[PDB]
Amino acid sequence: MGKCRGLRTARKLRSHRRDQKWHDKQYKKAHLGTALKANPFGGASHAKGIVLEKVGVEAKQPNSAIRKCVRVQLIKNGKKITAFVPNDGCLNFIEENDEVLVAGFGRKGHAVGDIPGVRFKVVKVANVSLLALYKGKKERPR
Amino acid sequence: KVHGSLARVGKVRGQTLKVAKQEKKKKRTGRAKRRMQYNRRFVNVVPTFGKKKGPNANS
Amino acid sequence: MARGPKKHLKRVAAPKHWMLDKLTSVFAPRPSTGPHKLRECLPLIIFLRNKLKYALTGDEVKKICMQRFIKIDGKVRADITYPAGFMDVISIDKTGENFRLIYDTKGRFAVHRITPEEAKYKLCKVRKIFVGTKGIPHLVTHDARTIRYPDPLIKMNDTIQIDLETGKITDFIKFDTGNLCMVTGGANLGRIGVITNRERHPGSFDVVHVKDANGNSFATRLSNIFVIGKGNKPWISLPRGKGIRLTIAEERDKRLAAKQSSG
Amino acid sequence: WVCRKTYVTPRRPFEKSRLDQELKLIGEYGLRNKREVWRVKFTLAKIRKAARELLTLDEKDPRRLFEGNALLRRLVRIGVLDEGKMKLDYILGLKIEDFLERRLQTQVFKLGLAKSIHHARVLIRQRHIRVRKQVVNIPSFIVRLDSQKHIDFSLRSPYGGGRPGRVKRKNAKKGQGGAGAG
Amino acid sequence: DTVTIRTRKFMTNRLLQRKQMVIDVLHPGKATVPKTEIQEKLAKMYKTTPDVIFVFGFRTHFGGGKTTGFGMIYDSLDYAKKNEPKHRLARHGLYEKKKTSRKQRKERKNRMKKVRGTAKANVGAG
RNA sequence: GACGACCCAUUCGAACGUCUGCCCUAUCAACUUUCGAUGGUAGUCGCCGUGCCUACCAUGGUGACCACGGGUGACGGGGAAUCAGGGUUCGAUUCCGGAGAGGGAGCCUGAGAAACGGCUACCACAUCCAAGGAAGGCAGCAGGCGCGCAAAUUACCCACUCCCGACCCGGGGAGGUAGUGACGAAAAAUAACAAUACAGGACUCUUUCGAGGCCCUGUAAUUGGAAUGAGUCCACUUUAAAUCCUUUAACGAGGAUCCAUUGGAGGGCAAGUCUGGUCGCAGCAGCCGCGGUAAUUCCAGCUCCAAUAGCGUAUAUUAAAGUUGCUGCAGUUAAAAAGCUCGUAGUUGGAUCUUGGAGGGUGCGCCGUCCCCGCCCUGCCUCCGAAGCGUUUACUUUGAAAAAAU
Questions:
Q1: Nucleic strand F within 7 A of Cβ B42
Q2: How far is the CA of D159 from the CAs of C42, D110, D147, D163, E65, in angstroms?
Q3: Domain residue limits, chain A
Q4: Is there a contact between A88 and B10 if contact means CB atoms under 8 Å apart?
Q5: Domain interval for residue D117
Q6: Which of residues 52-111 of E touch strand F (CB under 7 A)?
Q7: Domains by residue range for chain C, with CATH
C-alpha cells in the first residue's frame, strides 16, 4: 500500500502524487504548455496557410498508393507543414500559392493511417470547402 | 521517394458513369414516420420464428 | 471604484427582503443616507409602489411624494429613496392610514396598519449613552435620534418610548431577564419572545437566549435583540403572527386547512 | 436568463434491446422522436434520484418529512402516483409509462374524442381541444387530476360548433356558385 | 356578441386621484376589443365618463375570446391631466406634443457649447 | 409661499491592522542591509498606525513545516462544466473585491481623484498649416483597419428600471427598445379519420377440404366527408412610438406537395452473405483492416439504418480511466525495490490511572410494537444566583455569525 497511512501524512501523500503526475503524458503536456511552444497550430484547433507545393506521398506498407498532400506555410507563424488533401481528385482543387484551412487528423497530433509524417488535413480553399467543391455545391471561385 | 506521378488523379470518379437521381416518394414527417417505423418493425413485425430474416435483403 | 461614494445599486445586489424581482432592470433604488443603515432600510419608493401598490412607475412615486402626501415619524419626507426603517411610522393622510415598519417572521418589512394614535410614538433602542458638551448627557437611539438630558437609569441596550412630535423620551424599559423582545437581524430575524439569558463575553460578542410563547428557544447576538416591553405586554402593535415562526410542515398544515373549504 | 436542459441521451447508443423498448413507447405513445422518449427517461431518472436520496434519510427528519411528503403530494396531483406508493418506498419501485400516460394525446384517444393517439396529436396541435376555458396546443401538456373532466373540444373549431371549416366553408360555396347560378 | 367588461382587483387611490384596476374583457369567440370601446364601456360602470378612464396593458390570451388589461379612472379631469403620464394623455385626443427626433437637438447644444456664454448666438446658428 | 455656518454624533463610506486558505518549479537551497535588510529610541511626515523618512544605536529577520529565485494559455472570489460515492477540471466574461484607460512620471481642484470624455512633461504615435504655429487619445456606444479559427446596427427612446442636478418638469449609447443572432437552452409543424378494396394472425366450427371471426395494420384505389398555421391580411393588441409574440374577419393542404436534413450500412457499430463501374488503381480506413476481375468496406444508384430542425467534422478539456488509483494501483519474471547499512528532518510509537419502571416521536385494530431518556435489577472552590474559571489542546457535539444571483 506503498504509501504512509498516518493521520498527519497529508503533505507526503499530496506531494508524492504531485511528483508522479508527471509521468502522465497528457498532464505533462499541459503543464509544460507544449501546445503553445512546439506545436505548429497554436494551441488552436484550425490554422490557415499558403500552399507551397503539391506532394505525392508514398503510403506505408503494406498499403500502396500516392497520397496527395500540399505543403503549407502557416500565416500565423510562418511554420511549414504538410497537410493531406482528402477525397477523389480533390488535389485538383488546390493550386500553388492557394491559401487553405487546415485541421488536425483527430489523432491527438499523431499521423493517420498509411499516410506517413502528415498530421493535418485541408478543409477549405476558395475559402471554400473541399466538400462543397467536390460535390459541386459551390465552385473554385475566381 | 515521391518522384512518381499524379497523372491518374481522380481516375475512378471521372470514369464512374453518372446515375440519374430517378425518384419517387417523400418519406413521412417526424412522428408519423416514427409510427410507420414502429408498425413496420413491431406490429408488422409479427415476425416468424424462421430463425430470423433481415432489413436490407435481396432474394 | 476607487475614489468615492457609490451612488448606484445593481439590483440583485440589493437586500433580498425587499423582494424585488430578478428581471425589470439592472438597478434597485439604493437608500439615501438617513436614519437607518442601507441594508436595514426600506426606501419609501419600495413602500409606495412595491408593497402598497399605490404607485406603478417610479415616476408616480415621485409625483405622490411632491404632493407632501407622506410623512415618516411625523415630518413630511420628500425623497424617493428615503431610508425608512424599524420603528418608523409613515403616515399617509388623505387616505387615513398609519403604518409601522416592523418585521415579518420571514424577516421582511411588514405592511402593518396602526391606529391613529400610536402613530404618535415609536420605541427606540438606546445605542449609546453619552456625556456631551458643557457636561450635558445624551442618549442615542437606533434610528439616529439624539436626546439630551435623559434619565440617569437609561443604559446601553435599554429601550425608550419617544414621543414623536416633540422628540422627548416618555419613559423606558430596562434590559433584564424576562423582558419581551423583537429580533432585528440574522437567522431569527422577526421572532419575538421573552429573554432567559444573556451570555457575556469580554472582548466581544454577547448572545441572548430567547424563549418564545411556545417554549421555542433560540440565540442571537446582543446586537440583534431589541426590547419592546413586558412579557405578554408589548408596548407596540405586533403584526399578525406574533413573530412566532412555524416549521415548513406546520406552515403547510395551516395553508391547506384554512382554505378550499374552511372559511 | 437562467436555463436548463430537459433531456438526457443514453450512455450508449446501440443496444437493440433498448431501441425496441423505445419504439414500442413511441408507437403506443403517439410520440415523435427518441428525444421524445429520451426526455421522459431523463425526467424519470431525476425523480428516482430525488426519491433515492430521501429514502436514505431518517423518517421524521424535518428535511425528509417536509420534502418527502411534498414530492409525494406533487407526484399524486398529476396521477402519476398512488397512496401506498404515496410513500417514497413505492416511488423507488415505479416507471416511465406512468408519466407518459398523463400527456394530452393519449387521453383524447382514451375517451373516444379522437380514436387514435394519432388523431389526438393532430387534434391538439390544431387548436381543437380546451382544458376548460383554455385552448391547449401542447400535445406535450400533463393533465392534472381534477382537471381530467374539463377536457373537451373548443368553443369554435367547428366541432365545438362554429360555421364549418376554411375547407368545409370552401365546399359550401363549391355547390353554390356553379350549381345554384352563373 | 355582447362582450362583458369585468373590473378585477380594485383600488381607490386618493393620493393619485383615481381608481385603478385590472380590466378583464371576455369576447367569447372572435377576438378583441378597441381601447376606445373599452373606455366607453367602462365609463359606464364607474359613473365617471370616458375622458377619466385611461386604459393600458393588454394581451388577448391564448386561443381567443379573452383579454386582460389595466385601467385607471380619474376623479378630476384636472387631477388626471396632472398625475397623468404625458404620453398617456397624448394618446387620446387631448394630448400630443413635439418631437425631434433628439440628435438634432443634441447637435444644436454641442454647437452652442463652442461659443462663449451668449449661446443665443448658437441658437441663431442652429 | 419662494441656502450657508461651527462643533458633535449619524449615514454612505474611506485608509490601514488580525488570522486562516492559493498555480507550476530544486536543471531555484540558502536568502535579505551602507541607496534600511530585522530591532531600539526620538523627531520630522501623514487623516492617522508604521523605517514612511532621518539621525544615533544594536545586528537582526526568513528557510527542507520549500523560504529566496524563476516561470505562467494566473486578475482573485461567488460561481461553471463533468453527476456512484470519492472526485476531475474551469472561472477574462450579467455580482463582489482589486487594477488600468497609448507608455511612463508628476500635479491642480475639491470632502472624495494621483482622474486622462482634467492638465502637464518626456517617450512612442498620429493630425491640421498660408510652415510661424496649432490642436489629439473608442481596454465608452456604434462603426472602421489590422489580427486571426472566431464574434452583430455607423438604428429608436429616456416611457420602463434607476442616477444625477438648482431638479416633480431637464439630462443620461447608464439602461430600455428594435435589427443581426442554429453559442446554447424551451415548446415541436411539414399531415388525422372512415369506406370499398384487399394482404394478412391468435379465436371458433369442421375428420379433412373448407367456411365464419375479433383485433386490426398496411397497400392501392380513389373516394368521402372531416381539419390547422407556415405564408398572406381589414381590424386590434404590444409599446415612448413601432416590430414580433400572444389576437383575428377575408384567403391559405389531394401531393409533381405549402417538396427535411446530415452521417452510416465488413468488425467495434445500429444497417446490403446488393446492381452497374473499376481491379491493391481511384479511393476507404481514428484502430483492425478493405480493393491484385463473382468488391456485403470503394465510386454511384437502389435499398436500409441512426440521430431529426437539426446533424457531421476539428480541438481544448472532462467522463469512461481503479491508464495517477484518498476512497481505490503496480513493482520475483510484464514498465518499476537504491549493492548495503548508519542516520537528522519528517512520519510513526506497548500495556496502565471513573465503577424492569415510566416521559416523548408513527404503525397496526381500549390494547399494544419499535427508538429516545433520568434509573434501578460524576466540576471543584469560593460561601440559587454570582463569582472564583478553567491544566493545556486537537477532536467531536450544540448554537450564533454566516451576500444576493447561482
A1: no
A2: 56, 18, 21, 9, 17
A3: 2-142
A4: yes
A5: 13-175
A6: 56-65, 67, 69, 85-87, 91, 100-103, 105-106
A7: 2-117 (3.10.290.10), 122-172 (2.40.50.740), 175-245 (2.30.30.30)
